[PDB]
Design a protein around this ligand. Structure first.
Ligand code: NOS
Ligand code: NOS
Ligand code: NOS
Ligand code: NOS
Ligand code: NOS
Ligand code: NOS
Lengths: 230, 230, 230, 230, 230, 230
C-alpha cells in the first residue's frame, strides 16, 4: 500500500500502540494481544494486529527519531484510517525530581528539530498530546492506581547532544524526560484531525546515572487500558 | 515593591486571575469578589484582592502582548509568591468549527514571538498550560455543565498579522483561537515551579466575521470555581 | 471605530504623544493641554485631545511592549489618519556614559523581537525614527537649550532579560538605553507613509543602580515644542 | 557496550556498510559475505561481520532519518573504532536528467534538518562525503565500468515534504536525489577523524513516477569493491 | 601595517571618503584633492591622502559587499586611528518616488546579510549612520542648496537578488535605494566609538529602468563640504 | 555588457581563473599567459584573456567576500557563457595539521553568510566544488607530483571574526582553511549548469602565526594544468 507498509486499508485497528524497538513491538503483540497477526514487516518494522479484551488493536515499531515516526504516523492516519496512536517507550530523565523507572505521561514535547518550524511557517508550534489521550492515560493510571508523572517531554534529534548546557536548562524549566519522537507525532495527528499521546518509562537519568520490567509492564497496562477507554 | 507593582509580599492571594483590560479586572473584582481591596494601580493596572467563597483571590490586568504579561507574571511568582495564575479573556476564533461566544480552554499555545526561543537556546519550547490548571478548568466546566472546547491556542505578536496565510495554516492544524499572552505566561510558571492556565471567550472569528455577556459570565464561573479547586 | 478605540475619525489630532503608562497620559493631558477632552478610554488607555499653544494635540497610553504599541500605532495611522506619533517615556540606561535622569532621543532602535523579521521577509529591518521627528526633537532641545543624548535605543521583549551578556554587548556598541516600543512603532510609520519618533528620560541604569520630575518635565517640553514644529 | 549495540570492541570490522532496512542488511550479509556472524541485533538492527575477498567487513541497518543514523555512526566511530562507513541504499531522483534505477554517488548532501546548525554554531556546515571514499566509489565504478552519477544529494527530515516548491528548487540547482541520512553521517565522520561516503540506487522519481535488482546488485558491487580499495 | 594596507599609522587623515570603485577613488583624489599622495595600493585599492581647503583628507576604495568594506573600515578605525568614514557611491532606487540621478543620504541601512546578527547575538541591530555625519551631510546639502533625499537604504548581499518580491516590499516600507556596504560600515564605527555616514547618487531604478556626472559632482561637493564640517 | 564588465560575449575564454587581488590577476596574465589582452577593467578588476599551451584562458579579479565574487561569477556564466571558473588564491589555515605554504584543494566550503540560505529556502545548501574540477586539480597535483591537501574550506563574511570559538570548532571538524568566496561561487555554478573549483595557498595560520612564492607558483601550475584538462 505504501513504501513502508505492505498492509492494506483495514489491516490496522483504529488504535495503534507504537515503540521504537521493533522487537519490543513483537514482544508486546505476543505478550498482551490475543491472536496477533503480522500485518506489516517492511523493513522489519513488526506491525501486528490482534485484540485486547475483545477490541481490535495494532502494535508496530516506528524507529528512532522524528523523521522516522513522521513517516509511519502520517501513513497510518492518511492511508490506513487510524484514529489514535499511543507512543509507548523509554526515555531519559531530565528533572532532578524524576528518577529511573518512573512512568511519564507527556502533555506535550519540545524539540531541537526543525520539522515543526518547516510545517508552521517558521513559528513556534506547540507539539501537544491530544487532550483525550492524555486524559485516558491519566485516568487509566488513576484507576490502576499506578503513580505517573504528567508533564513536558523533549524530543531530541541528537541522542548524543553536543549542547551540554541544554540539560540543565531543561531541568530549570522542569522538562520531565527526553525521547525522540513525540514532537513529530503530535502535530501530524492534529493535521489529520486524529489523536496521539505518549507514555514512557524512565530507563536512566541524564544528569546522573542511576525491576525495569515491572515499570515497563505497569506502563503497558496504562497504555492498553487507556486504548480501550478511547 | 517592583517597578510595576506598589503592593508588598502578602497583598496578593496565591491564586490570581488576569485579563488584558484593566477595567475588566476592576469590574470582575466588584462583580465577583467580596470586600475587594485595591492593592496595586501602578500604570492603572487595577490589581485587587478579595475573597470568593471565603478564599483569598486577586484579580489584575496584564496589558496586551507577551512582553506585558511576562513582566507581571514573573513579578507575581518571584516577588509576591503567587502560586497560580489563570488568564481570563477574549480571543479570535481560528478553527472553522469554533464560533463566536464559544469558551476555549487552552492546553497550550503556539506563538510567532521570539521570547521562548530566547529562553530556550533557540529551540522549540512547548508553551504548555499546567496540567492541574487545565484539569481544574475542565472539571469546573463539567460540574457547571458548561460546554467548552479544549485545545491549542496561538499567541500572536501581531494583532494585525501581515502573514495572511497563517490563518488558514492554523485552521488546518486546528488551533482553536488567537490571543496574545498565553505562550509567554506558561513558560514563566514552569521556571518558577508554579502554575498557569488560560480560558477565553471567542469575541469574533478571524476567517469570517460573525449575548456576549452570558458567554463571558459563564467563563468567569468556570475560572472562579476552578480557582477554588486549586 | 476599532476594537481598541471608541473614538471616531477626527477625534484625534494629527500629532499624538504616547507613553506606556495611561495615568501618565492623563496627567500629561491635564498638566500640559488646554481643554483636554477624553476621546478614548477603551481598556483604560486614557486617550485625550486638546490644544497646545492653540494647536490640536492628542495624548494616549500604548501599554508596554512592541505588540501593544503596534496595535495602537497602526490603528491611529490607518483609521484616525494621524500623521505623527511621538513616543514619550522612560528607559533604562545601557551605555556607561549615560546616567539616570539623562534625556535620550532615539535615532533608531534595535530589538530582540521577531516582529520586524516577520514583516521584512526575515531580513534586518532598521527600525529608524523619522528624520523629520529626530530633527524636530533635537532642534527643540537646542532651542530650549536642554542637554539631550542622541543615538540608538533597544526595544526589548524581556524586561527581565535571561541573556545577561546582552547588556555588556550593547554597551560595547554604545546603545544608549532600553525601552519596549520604538522598534515596533518606527516600521509602522514607514508602512503608512507617516512619521514617528521617541524621546525618553533615563529612570535608572541597568549596569549599576543609581529630581526625576525636572528631567521628565524637560523631556515633555522638548516633545511638546517639537510637536508644534512638525 | 552501548544502548544500541550489544557487541564489543573488535566485533565490527574497520569498514562498515549500512542501509536503512535491517532486512536488507541481513540479505547483504548472507548474499555477499562469507561466514557472516550476527554481532548486534539490539532493536533488530541486524549488525553482521564477515569477510569479502578475505577482508573483514560488517554490515548493519541504521534506520531512517538523520537522528537514527547519527546514533549508530557516532557509536561505531567512537566505541567500536570503525574507520570507514559507506552508506548503501535507495533514494528519490530530483534532477530531470536522473532516472529510476540510476546509481548515484554523493559528493555531499544538503538538508532541511537543524542538526548541523546545532553542531556548527548555527552556520552552514557542508555535509561532505570523504574525498577518499568518493574516489574509491568512483574508481570502483570505473573499473567495473558501471555508469554512475556523481553529485549532490539531499537528506530530508520529511519524506512527505509539505514544502512542495523545494523539489523544483533542487532541480534548478541540480541536486541528484533525496534520501534521509547522508547529511548527518558525513559531519560525524569528520568529528572523529574517520571516513564516510554514500551510494544509492534511484527507486523512483519525485517529479514524475516512472530490473530494480540489477541496479541494486551493481551498486553493491561498487560499494564492496570500493570497501576493499579503502 | 595590515594584510590589506601597507600604510602606517599617520598616513591616513582622520576623515576618509570611500567608494567601491578604486578607479573612482583615484579620480576623486586627482580631481578634488590637492597634493594627493598614494598611501596604499595593496590589491589596487587606491588609498590616497591629500588636503581639501587645507585640511587632511584621504580617499580609498572598499570593494563591493559588506565583507569587503568590513575589512577596510575595521582596519582604518583600529590601526590607522581614523575617526570618520563617509561612504560615497552609487545605488539602485527602490521607492517609486525616487528617480535616477537623485542624491540619497542614508539615515540607516537594512540588510539581508547575517553579519550584524553574528555580532549582535542573533538580534536586530539597527545599522544606523552616525547622527553627526547625517547632520553634516544634510547641512552641507542645505548650504549648497542641493536637493537630497534622506532615509533608509538597504545593503544587499545579492546584487542579483533571487527574492524578486523583496523589491516591492521595500517600496511599501519606503526604503530609498540599494547598495552593498552601509549596513556593515555603521556597526563597526559604533564598536570603535567612531563615526560613519553614507551618501549615494542613484544610477538606475530597480523597479523600472530609466548628466550622471552633474549628479555625481554634486554628491562629491556635499561629502567634501560635510567632511570639513566634521 | 554588464554593470561590472565592459567586455562582450566572446571576449572571455570558457575557462576563467579568478583571485581576489586584481594586481595578482594582472601579474598572472603577464607571467603565465601568452598574448594577454585586457578585456575588462571596470572598477580596475583586471580581466584578461590570452592562451596557455595554445588554449584560450582568461584571468580576472573578483574582490573579497561572497557578495563580490557572486556578482562576477553570475555574470560570467550568464552573459559571457563561461563554463569553468577556478578560484586561485590565499587562505588562512585552521586545522592544526595544516601549515603555512601548504596548498589546499577545496572539496566544498562552509560559510557564516546568509546567501545560500536565501537561495535555498532557508535550508542547508552544501556549497560543493564541481567534482570534475576537484578531480582535474587533484590529478594535476598528482601528475606534477606537488603535495596538496584536499578537504573542506570555510568562507567567512568576517575576516575579523568576533566569534573566537568558531576557530577551534572548525579545527575539531577538520576544516582545512578559511577564505571568503568559495561558498558563494559553487552554488552559482550549479544554478547555471556550469563548473567551479578552488585551490589556495596557506598564507598564515589563524590558531598560531607561523618561500611564499614557490608555494604560489606551484599552486598556479596545478590550476593552469587542471584548466587544460578541463
Ligand atoms: O535519553 C534518551 N535520549 C533520547 N532518546 C531516548 C533516551 N532514552 C530513551 N530514549 C528512546 O529510545 C531511543 C534512544 O535510545 C529513542 O527512540 C528514544 O525515544
Ligand atoms: O483576534 C484576536 N487576536 C489577538 N488578540 C485577541 C484577539 N481577540 C481577542 N484578543 C485579546 O485581546 C487583545 C487583542 O485585542 C489581546 O490581549 C488578546 O489577548
Ligand atoms: O529598563 C527598562 N527596560 C525595559 N523597559 C523600560 C526600562 N525602563 C523603562 N522602561 C519602559 O517602561 C516599561 C518597562 O518598565 C516599558 O514600557 C519601557 O518602555
Ligand atoms: O524519495 C525519497 N525520500 C526520502 N528518502 C528516500 C526516498 N527514496 C528512498 N529513500 C530512502 O529510504 C527511506 C525513505 O523511504 C530513507 O531511509 C531514505 O534513505
Ligand atoms: O542596484 C544596486 N544594487 C546593489 N548595489 C548597487 C546598486 N547600484 C549601485 N550599487 C553599488 O555598486 C555596487 C553594485 O554594482 C555595490 O558596491 C553597490 O554599493
Ligand atoms: O585568514 C583568512 N581569512 C579570510 N580570508 C583570507 C584569509 N587568508 C586569505 N584570505 C583571502 O584573502 C582575503 C582576506 O584577506 C579574502 O579574499 C580571502 O579569500
Amino acid at each position: 500500500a505504501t513504501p513502508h507498509n505492505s498492509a492494506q486499508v483495514g489491516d490496522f485497528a483504529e488504535t495503534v500502540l507504537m515503540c521504537g524497538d521493533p522487537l519490543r513491538a513483537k514482544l508486546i503483540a505476543e505478550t498482551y494481544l490475543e491472536n496477533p497477526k503480522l500485518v506489516n514487516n517492511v523493513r522489519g518494522i513488526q506491525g501486528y494486529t490482534g485484540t485486547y479484551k475483545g477490541k481490535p488493536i495494532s502494535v508496530m515499531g516506528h524507529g528512532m527519531g522524528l523523521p522516522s515516526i513522521c513517516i509511519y504516523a502520517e501513513e497510518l492516519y492518511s492511508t490506513y484510517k487510524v484514529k489514535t496512536i499511543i507512543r509507548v517507550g523509554t526515555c531519559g530523565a531530565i528533572d532532578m525530581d524524576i528518577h529511573t523507572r518512573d512512568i511519564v505521561i507527556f502533555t506535550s514535547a519540545g524539540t531541537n528539530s526543525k520539522i515543526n518550524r518547516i510545517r508552521f511557517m517558521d513559528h513556534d508550534y506547540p507539539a501537544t498530546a491530544s487532550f483525550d489521550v492524555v486524559c485516558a492515560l491519566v485516568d487509566a493510571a488513576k484507576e490502576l492506581n499506578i503513580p505517573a508523572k504528567v508533564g513536558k517531554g523533549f524530543s531530541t534529534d541528537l541522542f548524543y547532544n553536543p549542547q551540554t548546557e541544554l540539560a540543565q536548562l531543561m531541568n530549570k524549566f522542569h522538562f520531565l524526560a527526553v525521547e525522540m519522537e513525540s514532537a513529530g507525532l503530535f502535530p501530524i495527528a492534529d493535521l489529520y484531525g486524529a489523536r496521539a499521546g505518549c507514555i514512557c518509562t524512565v530507563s536512566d537519568h541524564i544528569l546522573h546515572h542511576e525491576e525495569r520490567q515491572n515499570s515497563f509492564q505497569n506502563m503497558m497496562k496504562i497504555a492498553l487500558e487507556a486504548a480501550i477507554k478511547l
